[PDB]
Amino acid sequence: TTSRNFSVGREGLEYVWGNHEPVRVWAQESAPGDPHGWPHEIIIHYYHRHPV
Amino acid sequence: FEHATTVPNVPGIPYKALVERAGYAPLNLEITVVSSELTPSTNKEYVTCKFHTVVPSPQVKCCGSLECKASSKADYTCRVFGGVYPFMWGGAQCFCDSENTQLSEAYVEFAPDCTIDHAVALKVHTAALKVGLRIVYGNTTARLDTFVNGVTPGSSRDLKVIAGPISAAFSPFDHKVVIRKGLVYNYDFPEYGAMNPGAFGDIQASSLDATDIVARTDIRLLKPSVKNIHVPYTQAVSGYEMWKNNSGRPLQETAPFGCKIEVEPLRATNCAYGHIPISIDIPDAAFVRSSESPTILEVSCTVADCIYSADFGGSLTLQYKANREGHCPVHSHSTTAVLKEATTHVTATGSITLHFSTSSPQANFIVSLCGKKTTCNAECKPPADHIIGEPHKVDQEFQAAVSKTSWNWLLALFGGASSLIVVGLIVLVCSSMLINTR
Amino acid sequence: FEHATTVPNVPGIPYKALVERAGYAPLNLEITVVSSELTPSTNKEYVTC
Numbered sequence: 329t330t331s332r333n334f335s336v337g338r339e340g341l342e343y344v345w346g347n348h349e350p351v352r353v354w355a356q357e358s359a360p361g362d363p364h365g366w367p368h369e370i371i372i373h374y375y376h377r378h379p380v
Numbered sequence: 381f382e383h384a385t386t387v388p389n390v391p392g393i394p395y396k397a398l399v400e401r402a403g404y405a406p407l408n409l410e411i412t413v414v415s416s417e418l419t420p421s422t423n424k425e426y427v428t429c430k431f432h433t434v435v436p437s438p439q440v441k442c443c444g445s446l447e448c449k450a451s452s453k454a455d456y457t458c459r460v461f462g463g464v465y466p467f468m469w470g471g472a473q474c475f476c477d478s479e480n481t482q483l484s485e486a487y488v489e490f491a492p493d494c495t496i497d498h499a500v501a502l503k504v505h506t507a508a509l510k511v512g513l514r515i516v517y518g519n520t521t522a523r524l525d526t527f528v529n530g531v532t533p534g535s536s537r538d539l540k541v542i543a544g545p546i547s548a549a550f551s552p553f554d555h556k557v558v559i560r561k562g563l564v565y566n567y568d569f570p571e572y573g574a575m576n577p578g579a580f581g582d583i584q585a586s587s588l589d590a591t592d593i594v595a596r597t598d599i600r601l602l603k604p605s606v607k608n609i610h611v612p613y614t615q616a617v618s619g620y621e622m623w624k625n626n627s628g629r630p631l632q633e634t635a636p637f638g639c640k641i642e643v644e645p646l647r648a649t650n651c652a653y654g655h656i657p658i659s660i661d662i663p664d665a666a667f668v669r670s671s672e673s674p675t676i677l678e679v680s681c682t683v684a685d686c687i688y689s690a691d692f693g694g695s696l697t698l699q700y701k702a703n704r705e706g707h708c709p710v711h712s713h714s715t716t717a718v719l720k721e722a723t724t725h726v727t728a729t730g731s732i733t734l735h736f737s738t739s740s741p742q743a744n745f746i747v748s749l750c751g752k753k754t755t756c757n758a759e760c761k762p763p764a765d766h767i768i769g770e771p772h773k774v775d776q777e778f779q780a781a782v783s784k785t786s787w788n789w790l791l792a793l794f795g796g797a798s799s800l801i802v803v804g805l806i807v808l809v810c811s812s813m814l815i816n817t818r
Numbered sequence: 819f820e821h822a823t824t825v826p827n828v829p830g831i832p833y834k835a836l837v838e839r840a841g842y843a844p845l846n847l848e849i850t851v852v853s854s855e856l857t858p859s860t861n862k863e864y865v866t867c
C-alpha cells in the first residue's frame with residue numbers, strides 16, 4: 329500500500345485499478361479570481377490557470 | 381424545412397438548437413450522440429503462434445550409403461553422417477566401420493494449442509466512422525445510425541439527414557497491427573515470407589490450419605553422440621514467447637480520447653474528437669403555426685443565484701405575462717452558456733426557475749422564451765470541488781473568462797498621450813509661425 | 819459540503835451561521851458549547867497526613 333499523485337487536465341483523465349470497470353475523473357478551476365467591488369489580488373487565479 | 385449545424389464529437393451530450401420561421405413557433409431540436417463506431421478497412425496477412433519441432437525416426441542404412449534429399453516442409457533440413465554404430469536395448473542393430481550411414485531430417489509445425497493461442501498480423505487503412513444519433517424534434521424522437529461521409533444519409537423514419545465530413549481525422553491504429561486473444565497491439569510486423577530466427581513472426585500461415593507453412597529459425601543439425609541412437613538438434617527460441625514477454629502494453633491503455641476497442645470488427649467506439657457538420661430535413665407538419673403557439677408579454681430575467689461549475693450549477697428565474705396557455709421552448713442564444721431543460725407549462729402571468737451551465741463565470745447573455753427574448757447579466761463564482769469526471773466543458777472556452785471588472789481596469793488603463801502629443805505638435809507649429817513673425 | 823468558522827469559548831450560547839451554495843438554500847447551522855472539560859496530565863508524588 330502507498331499513495332500516488334497524478335495530475336489531471338481540464339479535458340479529462342482515465343483511471344484503472346484492480347479488475348473492475350474503470351472510472352473517468354476530470355477537473356475544473358477553483359482559484360479565487362473574481363473580486364467583490366473592492367481591490368483584490370485577482371491575478372493569482374489567472375496565474376493558477378494558464379501561466380501563459 | 382431544412383437546417384444545418386455543426387456539433388463536436390462527444391457521446392451523451394444533448395445539444396439544443398432552434399429553427400426559426402415567421403408565422404411558426406421555433407421548434408426545439410435536441411441532438412445526442414448515443415455512440416460512436418470507427419471501423420477501418422482490414423486485410424489479413426498471416427498467422428503465427430508457438431511452434432513444435434519434428435524429429436522423425438531417422439533413416440539409417442546398415443552398411444551402405446544415403447543422401448540429403450529435399451522436401452516442402454517449412455524449415456525442412458537434412459544431414460547425413462557415416463561410420464556410425466547405433467545401439468539399442470537388444471544390442472547393436474548394425475555396425476560397419478565406414479559403410480554404415482545415418483540420415484536425419486527436421487521440420488516444424490504449429491503446435492496443437494495454437495488453435496486458440498494464435499496471433500494474427502493485420503494490415504489496416506482508411507479509417508471509416510459510423511455514428512449513432514438520437515434526435516428529438518417537437519416531442520418526436522428518432523434513433524438513427526449513419527456514416528460521417530457526406531454522401532450517405534442514414535435511414536430513420538425515411539428522414540435523410542447528412543453529416544460530415546469529419547473536421548479532423550484521428551486513428552490510433554497504425555497501418556500494421558497484431559491481434560491476440562481479444563487484444564490489439566500496435567506493432568510493425570515483417571512481410572509475409574520475411575522471417576528472422578528469434579524474431580516475431582518466425583512462422584507464417586495464410587490460415588490457422590493451412591497446409592502450406594513457411595519459417596526460418598536457424599535449425600542446424602548436430603553430429604550423432606556416443607554410441608546411442610538419437611537426433612541432437614539445435615534451434616532458436618520462438619519469437620512468439622519473446623514478443624509476449626516484451627510485447628508492450630495493450631493499445632487499450634494508450635489510445636487517446638478514451639477509445640473502447642474491440643477485435644471481431646477491429647473497431648473503436650465511444651472515442652470522441654473533432655466536430656461534424658450536419659444537414660437536417662424536417663417535415664412541415666411537425667412545425668406549429670405561431671398563432672397556435674402562446675404569446676408572451678413583458679417578461680423579465682432574474683438570476684436567483686449562480687456559481688461557476690461543471691454541472692448545471694447555474695440557476696435563473698423568469699417572470700412572464702401571457703395571453704394563452706400551452707408550451708414554449710427556451711434557448712440560450714449565447715453559446716457560452718447552455719440550459720438543461722427545453723420547455724415547460726406556461727401561464728397567463730406565471731414564473732419559472734431554470735437550470736443551466738456555462739464556460740465562463742460572467743453570466744452576461746440573452747435567452748429566448750417562445751419567440752421573444754430577454755437579457756440576463758450576473759456574476760458566478762468558481763466552485764470548491766475541482767475534480768469530477770461527469771460531463772463538463774460542454775462549451776469550449778472563448779477567452780470570455782475575462783471578467784467585466786478586468787475589462788473596466790484595462791479600458792481606463794491604456795493611455796492616450798498621443799492626442800496630447802498631436803496637440804503639442806500643433807501648438808508648436810503655431811508658436812513657430814508666431815516666432816517667424818519676429 | 820465543507821466550511822470553517824471560529825467561535826469564542828463560552829457555554830450555552832448558540833451561534834447561528836450560514837453555508838452558501840448557488841442552487842441550494844443556505845442552511846442555518848446552530849452551534850452550542852454544551853460543556854467544557856479541561857483535563858491536564860497528572861503525576862503522583864507522595865501522600866501525607
Ligand SMILES: *[C@@H]1O[C@H](CO)[C@@H](O)[C@H](O)[C@H]1NC(C)=O
Pocket residue numbers: 518519707
Ligand atoms: C407534442 O406536442 C404537441 C404540442 O406542442 C402535442 O399536440 C402533441 O400531442 C405532443 N406529442 C407527444 C407525443 O407528446
